[PDB]
Amino acid sequence: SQTPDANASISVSYKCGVKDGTKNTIRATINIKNTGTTPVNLSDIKVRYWFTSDGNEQNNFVCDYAAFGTDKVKGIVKKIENSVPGADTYCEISFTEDAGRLAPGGSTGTIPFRIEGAAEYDQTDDYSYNSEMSDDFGDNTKITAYIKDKLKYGVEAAA
Numbered sequence: 001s002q003t004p005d006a007n008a009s010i011s012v013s014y015k016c017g018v019k020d021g022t023k024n025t026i027r028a029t030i031n032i033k034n035t036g037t038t039p040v041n042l043s044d045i046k047v048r049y050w051f052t053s054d055g056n057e058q059n060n061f062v063c064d065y066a067a068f069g070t071d072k073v074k075g076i077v078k079k080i081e082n083s084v085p086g087a088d089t090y091c092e093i094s095f096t097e098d099a100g101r102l103a104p105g106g107s108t109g110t111i112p113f114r115i116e117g118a119a120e121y122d123q124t125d126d127y128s129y130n131s132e133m134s135d136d137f138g139d140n141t142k143i144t145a146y147i148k149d150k151l152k153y154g155v156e157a158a159a
């Protein structure tokens with residue numbers, strides 16, 4: 001019986017991006033799909049990307065494209081106080097109130113983003129990194145996604 005907001009479901013698919021010779025940029029692309037039977041508002045969706053910042057105290061998020069406008073995508077980067085395997089930092093991606101809604105079976109398509117540091121990142125020790133998904137989008141369950149702050153996709157980096 002549950003009601004609409006308990007049967008709402010999303011999934012995220014992921015593509016690892018390129019790395020060059022400066023190595024101070026994390027690149028990745030996500031796609032958010034509505035896999036349930038009711039419409040979801042993008043403003044109720046958050047996505048987290050978990051990583052180790054490798055000494056960088058400044059980690060800046062930028063969204064480079066979204067079908068509905070980059071100006072509708074927000075990101076913040078927060079430190080994690082305690083120690084968890086593969087993450088001392090997370091990047092939390094959210095959407096503004098006018099980003100729109102996803103119908104059932106709808107998806108955002110590609111949302112590429114960068115996290116930029118002053119110093120080099122080693123991505124092999126980042127929880128959310130999966131280099132096997134370089135050629136194609138894959139089911140990276142080490143990125144998590146929330147609807148109204150409830151976990152709906154993935155497995156959280158766990159103390």
Ligand SMILES: [Ca+2]
Nearest residue numbers: 052054122125
């Ligand atoms: Ca790292």
Ligand SMILES: [Cl-]
Nearest residue numbers: 095096097098
């Ligand atoms: Cl807003």
